[PDB]
Symmetry: D3
Subunit: 329 residues, 6 copies
Amino acid sequence: QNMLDNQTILITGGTGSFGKCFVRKVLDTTNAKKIIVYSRDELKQSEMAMEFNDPRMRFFIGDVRDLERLNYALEGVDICIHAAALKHVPIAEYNPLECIKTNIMGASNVINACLKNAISQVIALSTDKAANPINLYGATKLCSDKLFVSANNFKGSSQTQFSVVRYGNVVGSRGSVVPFFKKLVQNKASEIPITDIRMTRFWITLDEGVSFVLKSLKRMHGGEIFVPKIPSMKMTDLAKALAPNTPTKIIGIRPGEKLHEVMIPKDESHLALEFEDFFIIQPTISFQTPKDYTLTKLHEKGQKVAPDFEYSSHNNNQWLEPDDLLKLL
Amino acid sequence: MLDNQTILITGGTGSFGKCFVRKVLDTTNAKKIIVYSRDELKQSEMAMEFNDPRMRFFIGDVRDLERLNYALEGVDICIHAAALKHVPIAEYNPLECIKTNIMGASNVINACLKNAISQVIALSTDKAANPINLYGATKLCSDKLFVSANNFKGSSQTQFSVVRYGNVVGSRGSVVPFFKKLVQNKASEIPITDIRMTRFWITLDEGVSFVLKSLKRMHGGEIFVPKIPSMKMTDLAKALAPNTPTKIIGIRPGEKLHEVMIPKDESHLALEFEDFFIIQPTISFQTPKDYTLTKLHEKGQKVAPDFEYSSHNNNQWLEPDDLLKLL
Amino acid sequence: MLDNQTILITGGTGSFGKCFVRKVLDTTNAKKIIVYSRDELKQSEMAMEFNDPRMRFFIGDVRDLERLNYALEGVDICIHAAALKHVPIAEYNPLECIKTNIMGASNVINACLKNAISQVIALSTDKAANPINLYGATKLCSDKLFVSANNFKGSSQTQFSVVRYGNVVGSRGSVVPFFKKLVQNKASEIPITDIRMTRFWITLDEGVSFVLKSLKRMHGGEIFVPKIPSMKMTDLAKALAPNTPTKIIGIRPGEKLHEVMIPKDESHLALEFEDFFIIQPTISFQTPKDYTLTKLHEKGQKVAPDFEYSSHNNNQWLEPDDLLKLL
Amino acid sequence: QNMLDNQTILITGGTGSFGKCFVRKVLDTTNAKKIIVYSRDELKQSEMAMEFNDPRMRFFIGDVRDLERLNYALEGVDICIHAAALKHVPIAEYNPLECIKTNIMGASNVINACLKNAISQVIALSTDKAANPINLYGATKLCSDKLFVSANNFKGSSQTQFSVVRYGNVVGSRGSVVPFFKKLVQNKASEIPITDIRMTRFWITLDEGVSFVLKSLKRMHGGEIFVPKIPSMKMTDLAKALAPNTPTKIIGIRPGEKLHEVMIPKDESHLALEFEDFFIIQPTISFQTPKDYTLTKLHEKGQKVAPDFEYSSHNNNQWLEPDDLLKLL
Amino acid sequence: QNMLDNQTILITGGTGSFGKCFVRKVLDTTNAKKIIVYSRDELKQSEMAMEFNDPRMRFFIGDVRDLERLNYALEGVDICIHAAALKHVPIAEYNPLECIKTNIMGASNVINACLKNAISQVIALSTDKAANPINLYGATKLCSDKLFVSANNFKGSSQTQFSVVRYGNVVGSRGSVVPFFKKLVQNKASEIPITDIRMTRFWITLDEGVSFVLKSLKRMHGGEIFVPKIPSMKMTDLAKALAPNTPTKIIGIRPGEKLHEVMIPKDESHLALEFEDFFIIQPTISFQTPKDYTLTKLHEKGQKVAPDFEYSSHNNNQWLEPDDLLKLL
Amino acid sequence: MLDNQTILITGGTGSFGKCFVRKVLDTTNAKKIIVYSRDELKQSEMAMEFNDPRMRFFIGDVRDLERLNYALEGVDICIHAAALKHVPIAEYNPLECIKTNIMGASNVINACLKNAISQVIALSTDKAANPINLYGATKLCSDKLFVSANNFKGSSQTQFSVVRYGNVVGSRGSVVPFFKKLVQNKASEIPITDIRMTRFWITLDEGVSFVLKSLKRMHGGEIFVPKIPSMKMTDLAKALAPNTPTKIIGIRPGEKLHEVMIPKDESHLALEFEDFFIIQPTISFQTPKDYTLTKLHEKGQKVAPDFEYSSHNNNQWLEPDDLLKLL
Ligand SMILES: NC(=O)c1ccc[n+]([C@@H]2O[C@H](COP(=O)([O-])OP(=O)(O)OC[C@H]3O[C@@H](n4cnc5c(N)ncnc54)[C@H](OP(=O)(O)O)[C@@H]3O)[C@@H](O)[C@H]2O)c1
């Protein structure tokens, strides 16, 4: 019950869509002692401090590529939510090392600084793009996920648990598809570009993600890659919600984009454990002090999966109509 | 043209390393061949087996940008083969693999641009296509860095390409050579992972010739893939042991049943050729290039929309008798 | 001459940033304009609003010397506008402001000399004259570094100048634009700091034109100051709200009642011109310069011994009606 | 009473005028367990160890720009006096980054290393040149002062107090004015250069400064910029003490020099608190665990000041005659 | 008695001749809780894990030139054996900075990381080449030895003892003389090269070295340079054991080679203490908390030496015949 | 040829430092002499005593590679005299001595190659031959780095040599000058270490002339050793105090009874000359050199097989009367 009770939480990339939503959720629904936003931009932090004018907030201007600054911010932290990252796929293809420095080396420093300040639980955000990735960005998240999972194979005088939360497209995220079909039809959208007529994706709301991360804290043992069960929607149906009466030119594809997204690769189905509405991808490596992932801290039991299971988007159980999208737009 | 050129190869004391050096001495007119690796043990031995004037050894680490700057001084061609490739060990030492493979790639690129090297080819791997293990992810980032490196421009231009191929028959501590120490071990029990297991197979000599060919074809920015045969991991044992038991020890941390070399989501970037494949960059360059015509004037063509070059669905297969011919 | 030149501007996605880019495209013949900033959000948007061939974006941090080296490759002109300027936030995150503003300045200078950039202009601020807050101190060190950078010499010379001016009307999150969100907020209560509060006021467009003019005037080593109007912070509210209460919320961490732009102890270094002021270096250079004649052959003159260009004692003042004309 | 009793003290720039005087004062008047001199030059340390041949002394060759070395020296220290710096104003104008590295980054590393080794009290030396500065040097001290004051806004498992001590010209300092009018008249001073006939400065003795720093330790809460009440003297009267019978040519001004020095800027008078003979400039930012600066640890009460107060040299209460200067030369 | 009982041991350069032998000795003869091999090559570690397939083993891929990685590996270690190094003398002459980075800076980081993780005992391996050295390699070991000895002059909240073990040529080491006269006669040795006909060296077996290091742990106080009493053999007699029936061409000398090796320099005989079969070269500097090196932890008493003693190889008590060499080949 | 050349000398404010500068101004036509050292105290004073246009001071640390890069810009000759030499202090602060002497040497070499300096001479010491103390070990590594630095090659070549000699009579805080402050101290008690104590003795002026001569002789890679006299440490007191007691205070941390300058195990590398010795490199270079003929065409010759240049067995000795003539 309420384990953020009197705990100090630090969230990197805290000024982003997830960050503001996560901070908002934690402030409203928990007795967290203090909530630390760790990010770089003074503009956004300056703005955020005004809209979240709360004494339980602390803003540290800092970069996840700077270990000394992180070591200083995590000082006395209990829980670290790692949401900082460079995720604009095509921009990442043109700026490889930047994305590597922020996502890979950033993961690296956060883990180092958390261990040093003896943090209790750490959850880093992943992405479906990190499974059998093709673009660099996805490659940097895969390296990220791997570091956090491996970070558990440590042995300090205070067990620090490291877990990962992976989920697909965030319906209407700060720069996604939905938040475009609105910004275009607002400035006389001559026509809203599309791509492949097979394009499918997983879907979830920002609130669902936050809630999920918040709950993963309650059942995590450390080492897990939690995957929530979410619905998928073909990119066509997403053409009748923010401009059905406006044509949509066909672009086909964009740099480093897939036709379908993978959440749980086939080659990892033996590590995958199933639950009522979420999966647990177990560590591919073994830890010194092994844990039993079949029983979460929330005493929710899990069963393995089909030796030939593949949790992909091109074909999942749940889907969504252009109404549900507006009903949850 | 390698004539009178200076060539540096990171990870020069490795399998590919030794073989590449041997091939360059014997067949090219390279003026100088520089080996850049960390271990003094392997370098002293290698200098003994290759007692040749055109050879030069530099004790160095790719994680050291300053040292690379120093050693790439006056080099025309750079072959990047340095890496931590043990997949399961990379799973336990992720940051080590990231520093060597990813940062390593970054430094090399930096030193190469600085010393104005003409062409660079970095060695990739099939494990970098739709990767699952850390090693593959690092190599994927590596390929990316090298491909992106082509957008840099100054008083001098540098061409960066990548060569990607699967398992190397009898590579430094691989499977095939292991299926020997077992025969010698008077042991009668072959350790398998999964009857479905499949991989692409290229020879040390073939990989090396493909790199040399690539140098002559590259515009810069390509990921060259040689068309090589696949082989059921069930026959690799059969062939190298027609009689002996196969104890299914399961899968190791990070293994795939089949390795992809040209992902399905990249078929549109692929260009087919007589013996090879060029996966085109996914980004545009200041100075565009036409990958349909190599520098050797070889014409390439697009592949079918649902194309994918994997080990499972390969039209070529190594025969247990034609495999024994490799060794 | 910006004709056919390559221009890089750190902090290119900022207010001055976007405006400077717009002015350079529309009016110059600059061959290439490079935006160098950290955020992918602002850069993707900016590339959309400026869909032009001569534009190029580099995701980078001024705290990264290696990345700057890379991006300044082949650049002729460099405009340094990157900085952490929120005064109170700089008061809580001093080292952050020091790293970005002071170290940032240092790296840029280094990369500029390395890539042999012809001219560099760094943006200063009135808060850097007889400063009190951390931000101002960092900018003061910045100006100093840039001014001192002119003593460096090699096969190529690089000119470093600084442009200093006060508040930018309606700048990214300033006061004036805030006195709008309040009107919209249906709020009837204007937050003031002190009836005496005074500041210099220049427009985004004016600041930009002054930088472009400076490039054409600079010998290297100058701190250009434009003659701009002052305005009682009491009228900025009056003008933008002839009717509404003013609740004196006091002073914020680090504020001054009046901002100096040319200190009294520097009057001897000052040179007066038609529209601007040049504060001469306090040190001597290997290659001296005559700051009394800009490159546009504009003749300057010394000011009175007890001279000081402050906001409190300014001979020019923005009229609440002529202020509404800015917006 | 005697709080250096059995404490280990580390003083950076310990081989300088202040350092030798401070070490001398501490050795003679306290039961400090050990006194660590942290500086770079082997020559001076070598010399100092001979003149201060005391077992309670420890000399660490080190640079304040090297965090690892500092982390190693502060190990087990209780009190840190930070006196290291580059202060030759004109030399600083020609060597900007050097002065920045030593004074700014140096401040930076000392604070970091003190926190890491859980030091109790830290006092960094400032200078009147840091108030409304014009020269770079002064700018580096202002950045310094700001870092030390901000360093208090931390929260480690052992409160470390950070304070600053600022005062003007040190009568006859290792390279000042007085110690020149002697070195010139000794080698047939044809004429001793002067400047502006309005030039005024604050004055204090090396011993007074040491004593002041030593007492600031006894009353500091952490976060203060202590300013002692000291006298001022026009640069003319300082022309009749070490060569009244020798002319003085007029140079006018030197690189980055002011006519008058500011100790407490007008724009900070609201932060300024007054006491019988010293001031306390309060933090412009607020700390999490606020302290009451109106009551020092020495139970000395302070009152605010005139809303339009300015503690400048061009006009202060106390002044000095060319006798007092020789009477205290 | 058995002080490795339940202790965690970390040995850098653990995949080398010494490393494998040392790990082998510790696994077989002690109740060490865990044994950590710290080295760079995946090939060797991969190989070693197979031949030493023991649960009490842990392999960390790491470089001694990387402090952050070391800080992470020594975490929770009790005893550190430092065997990592670049020792190919001529290769070191052509790659000076490399050898300096690995041996000097490597020593530097290990000491730093051991202190940080509060290691109990640390023994770094030296070499007779470090006494009055001529080659760079030897110069890097001398700098190394000096750092470890000096490392004792520290004062942390957990005394860490630092000692050095120095001995000569390891009979048949991974790349020495003996292991050559075999690899040559195996591939039709036309003739096996030799040098100066005065060439003498000290000798010892790999097992003797391990055992010695293992025992130095039991009697060390910290600060010692233990030197075992070992025999010497002229390079001629070493020509009748692995090819007496094959001629030996005369090369004379090689880059940076001496005619004779020094173990205890004459100028240090006043620091040297003698024992039944090993020497103790005492610190040239004095520590704050001085120890009595005349009485080892094994209660073995030692007496000083002749004020003009020199422990060189060109003339020592024990020697060896080409039989003993094969009898112990 | 120092004519119209730019000379930088690290540790320029030191004993050798000041003397070298004085000799270069007075006798050469060097266009510029740059002093690169850390302390502002000593530099401000030195600039006063050397108020000359060709002088220039750079506040910097040899541990700073970036700063060295900056200061060596446009330098032709580099004299490396910066170091921590106090033997006992180096014994307590080993890493400090290693950073300054060893890393310091490394950075200087790096910056020199980068800025394409023509010739570099680094100051060594007798304590670096068959060393025992940390200081000597660091200098030995230093010499090595500099000697090895000659194997680097690019569009420009740089020559690196080392000058090695013993004690400098009355050097900044040495023995002789101390045996003065004792006389002045009205003290009647001379502190000795050991009646056998012996050292080589060269004058500040001699060391400086030998460096200047070396520049004119060097091919690059040599360790020049001047033939200088030895002197019983018993006479240095006798001479400077014919009457006063000698209280044997023993030996200090790291002292030798006698200092070697050319080790016995190096006699084969030595080449004898009229006034000096060249110890040849122990490694071979890409571009070999003939050290038997300096650039001044001085012919050298091999020494006897068991040769060794030590202070104990020197054929030259300073006479207590000819020593007083030095001072
Ligand atoms: N002294 C002798 O009797 C003797 C005998 C044989 C050989 N030598 C050789 O002569 C050389 C110089 O001797 P010296 O008597 O002129 O010594 P010195 O009087 O101690 O001068 C050495 C100078 O090096 C500078 N320095 C020290 N650390 C530095 C750093 N980290 N970065 C930049 N500069 C640094 C110091 O200047 P700052 O403190 O202002 O930085 C100092 O002025 C030595 O290297 C030694 O090898 C001396």
